[PDB]
């Protein structure tokens, strides 16, 4: 029940968002910074686990490792997730 979320990274500006990394077993979106680029988009939402970037699997990555990554992507960025948010 997960789900792929893709969005362009074609500039030098943060995402804007904010990533629990304390136990990558379970990365926790966190953060999201209102009017960044994640935001805009839509493209995630607080709560929001990421399980795998551009199909490497966050949980067999180190923080330094999930760090520099992230950071250092540029292009097409797709995320599984799995989403926090469920309508009844």
């Not at 136990?23 to 607080?46: F, K, P, Y």
């Not at 199909?55 to 997730?81: D, H, P």
């Amino acid at each position: 029940r997960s789900r792929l979320v893709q969005f362009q990274k074609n500039t030098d500006e943060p995402m804007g968002i904010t990533l629990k990394m304390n136990e990558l077993n379970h990365c926790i979106v966190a953060r999201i910074m209102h009017g960044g680029m994640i935001h805009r988009q839509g493209t995630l939402h607080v709560g929001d686990e990421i399980r795998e970037i551009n199909g490497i699997s966050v949980a067999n990555q180190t923080v330094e490792q999930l760090q520099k990554m992230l950071r250092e992507m540029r292009g097409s960025i797709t995320f599984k997730i799995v989403p926090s948010y469920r309508e009844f």
